[PDB]
């Protein structure tokens, strides 16, 4: 049993050491988030360096996500300290730097007055104190408002404008430096803050394209209404999504966010692109060893909603119980996951799914994995397409993605139910198949007799559509011969050359192994789950009896009575006529 | 569009006035909860009295729920003030009243030592400070423990014992007085606190039976592991359930509660018995006009889980925004409900449902209501069985329960999607049917042409199984004749006796009303959605044309050209041959 | 469109020439039946020889079926000529050769009296005249009976005994010689007449095993109640089945046969073993060019029942319109087949199917072939297992089985919807895949843009379970680049380097091929189904526009404007980023 939903942790003072990181990783951290809104390139440079060292101290794959600072409209200084503003006040905002006073403050987006409408609402201090756009002196360039939910307003607080769509083309000067730095550093992900439209995503793509770093995934962070309204084009342009519940609650009424989160997740789910649920996860855990009923409930639900990953912020960045937050986050996932209705999800995703070859194979893989209750879905992959695609169908069986590039493995560190593994790049179908079978065996997730569904796209050496599927039995072929009938059975071997041995060693459900049977062995035979004989042909006593009793029989197995020993767990395949090691309930 | 999930509000200083109550009711309060853990019979007596007066000031049906105090193990006095206890301390609990000190305190359940095991865990002060059962001196009767999550411990704090099953047979002396008082008062519900087993429920039933007040519903409150473990027998014995998330988090680890809540709700859902989600709903609203993203999220999810009702405590009992809490609670319900997957729920409930006549009719009603997209499911009822049953199938269409007893209406005030109405008790099927049709019309939920599914059990004058269903068109029969064909259509009437009128007044999709048609009217006819003629027989020009063009035609309608006027919205029923007022898309 | 149900024709005087055979084959004969109840080894030897010569004159695969004579109880001579016997008569049967007279005749199964019970029924002259077993003088060995449906009884007529189970162990002396002769001759099939139990099938198997000719399929012919009663063990032992309606009607009441035929076919269908519907097919066609409404109806229904093949007897053996019988048989199949409910059949076979790997792949193949409406299901096969298995699911798409042995091809000549083709034996998955793709192309059944589902079992060089599936697009890859978006489209190419060319050559739905787009090309762009550009990167004008208009775009296609020409039918794959020849509706 393995956790499906991935864990993303914000790195900080409480989790920047190598030993700390070594711990976060062992607790289950899949992605390390770097918040570039704070700290300098030297600090992140060292954190990054440590992630990699802890990643080696342990044999864990951890991706690096760079959360940028992004655009935002802020306020200037409030005369020496802070202003007041009551339930009224004549607060006028100037589109020019002015010393903020109870009457006139200023913002950093002179384009505001050229976007905000009358009666509109402006929020400051992350939404604490709000305003009402009374008049708009377009002339002097001063948006007149009346203080609403007043309070204390210090220097440089957040300016939020919900209703209007703000335009801040191009990436910050700062974000640009951060990005390039991230490229030099070789990060795996980039969470773009305050994405409102597809173009914000394209800008980062263009930049990555210009520095030959297209390998870097772009996660669009939704933090306002525009971003929520443009979600379709945004997802269509980005590589993933981050749902920041806290930021949303700033511009959007609380009573509306819940369905928004659920809607944003489903949309990502339908596109098969990773989605991260962030902020207000286990906040209380910065001070406490355990979370609140509420927090456990909110997290559990983000998982039922379909989130690929959950994110920790201050809980791992500065809190007092970093490793614990990851641990409970881990335990919360395992517990909720047992409640997942896999058949249903598959059915829902099949519907609402576009008619494609990749999707037809994915659905076939997902359905087969369920009906046969396979031990695993293995996916040798070039760039990770097949694994991500299969993950979309939210399979019960683990997805073992076998990459030939460590960076590709990290790309999958964020994907639901995907555990990566590396192997030499293969170019022929039989190689990819062998590599898949090998990975499954090493994974420790399969025992002889178990089944795995291997899926991938051929060519195989190239990335592309998923168009091939194979069901593969793990067990070894012990021997073969002429199989009689069409069924299969397993049980424990009972070597018996003579009737006397047959009647003394044969137990109920045993697999009789002998040279040949005859009328004197009937009693022992009527207890057998199957029969293996060295002798006989298609009409020998063992075959005839097998047909009449309806039990599998394999005839002509060379040294059957010497290569199989008492008590050996084997599977007798009547149709095809083969013996396998261990118990295989489906063949 | 109507809210489905019912709202339960705890009455208190902030909501005890008549004007206040008049407000809570208009905001959507369905049930008024009386917490008997505080206050005396005179106070509740007056609150009850006010509910009834506010209930009359408005035309609202509000049920009265009595939340009892129930059993619980408490601690005695802590020497004058309070004790300390650190991460260790030698805290010994005495099964006898002793002056609590940092070394020896006492409880009020001397049967404790005869239930608690070694290494067990005891919590005090609602779970704040916990202990570890080191030794158990069964001799001197002193359970030895070592203080764990220490803190300050004042007088008479809560003693919680999670692991062990406490036995407190019979109802408190206090609960008994409260119950009887509730009976005298004529309450509708009784929420029994700390239900652990079916027997706790039986005790209240027995008492109600002994005072001839069996009409009173018993809502079992789950607040500990035992109650969670015994949920099946408890639900099987009680009339409803209350999931108290706060209490659970005291004995049960937070990370486990979420699935417990979901499990408790589903179990109630499957039995068709009302379930209330309580505590930690909109707590922050005691101080604020709006809730938190989290709170809105938790409530929304309790609704997706299937709760019939949500409960407000301090938010309406003592908070600063009572009427607002109810209002947001109302708005949160309406919004989440739009996201309900009605077909799916029905499908799930059909499965996991016992093969009964009542359930077969309910499923048929629910499926038909969905396929025909009916305006309402009306249920004349004697004791409320049919409405509760249909509610279990969580229909999109409103359920209009028509009772002949106001107390029965209040019983349904707690049920999901059920809006009651009273009418004289009927005893014949046609009376019940007429009463149902009447209720639907008054409800304001249906317009001419809409459909309603009426369901009930006959006899009808008696309560019992649900075994009858009828689909009924609301519209009035304007006229009849020989209908031609099998289809139906509506549109606007176009009275035209002559070809000249036909060609000047006929518009696309109109319903041609004339004495008879002929070759000269063809152009107008080829624009008609249907035709009505005073003349002709089954082979007249209008009928023949109707068959060939595939449009409905009704022949032999007496004064058709004078009783129908231009622009009148009507429906022409070819099969059966009838004209109805308004547009009826299904007949 | 190809006929699915195979046609089996009895060879004779009317169809033994090479030119005749050349004709039967071109009309659609798949299997040539040799009735060994008549003729000598020299005659069949020459017929066989001719089949092979006609088979070469044409490029057709025709299997050879040897219908044996089998056991049967007959009567001896009736004194010089024939006996009478009326509605009474004292007809006593002697278990010893006696001159048949109106009073005492004899049979050739002295074991009869030791099997028949009192009041039993004996039929003679293929069922014409029946008897009633009055007394059974076990002493003198004379079964006493009273003539029932009397008539004329000549020499050596058929003795049928319906009720009792006759025992005739071992194969006839005659059948044995025929079999061996068939082996020397190298026949493909052997239809064993009058199979009553599994043991009759084993005897032929044993013999084939002893002459190293196990490759030879055994078709069990059901012709009596025992065979009908033992159908399960019989099918479990044989390789196929022959339903002889005429023979059945001899021992079984006519009103019961219809459901028996349907039951025998379904049972074979469920095991995935070929079933032949025989006798009374188009009998009237021996004298007429066309069949009767009844005959066409009976044949059509045998097809709706699920028969893999239909068989012609005298219609091709001695009749006057051999080639016509085959032709109408062919036309009747094509017409009825259009009415087949493929989805339904698949659904039925999935249910009632054993949980196996082969069946899971088959169902997946069958479902995918249906959802994607593929042009064909190709199955490279070693012994024919995969094709037979897929045929069981009765696919709409043709099954192209690619064997590396001509004898295997003939084995499949009898299987529903299977058209064989030969190719060099391959041993690697990519070879088998390539061989499959090649076969599909040569088949003439696929055009560029079509899909085929290739399925087979790996190893691949060995026969065994079916465990691999691949969906493959037929079209050629014309070029590649960075695909933008996730969709695909086709249409006709429109090469336009400048805005002026774009606005003069662009038509609705066209695929714009250019160096790069810009604001001046918008009008042409808004008509495009897709865009191909030589230039740009992921954020160029063409890509951005493609994202916003929701149409596929492929960027960076090298000589796009010179390798694609006006009017060229191509498919643009946004996701994956590739261009294909022809129109491919699914990728």
Curated annotation (Swiss-Prot), chains A, B, C:
Q: What does this protein do?
A: Catalyzes the phosphoryl transfer from phosphoenolpyruvate (PEP) to ADP to form pyruvate and ATP. Has a broad specificity for nucleoside diphosphates and can use ADP, GDP, IDP and UDP.
Q: Name one Pfam family in it.
A: PK
How activity is controlled: the entry says: Exhibits homotropic positive cooperativity for PEP. Allosterically activated by ribose-5-phosphate, AMP and other nucleoside monophosphates but not by fructose-1,6-bisphosphate.
For activity, the cofactor(s) needed are: Mg(2+); K(+)
Subunit structure of this chain's protein: Homotetramer.
What is the protein name stated in its UniProt record? Pyruvate kinase
Q: Which protein family is named in the record? A: Belongs to the pyruvate kinase family. In the C-terminal section; belongs to the PEP-utilizing enzyme family.
Q: Describe how the cofactor binds.
A: Can also use manganese or cobalt.
Q: Among its keywords, does the record have Transmembrane? A: no
- Catalytic activities: pyruvate + ATP = phosphoenolpyruvate + ADP + H(+)
Quote the EC number: 2.7.1.40
What would be an example GO MF term here?
Answer: kinase activity
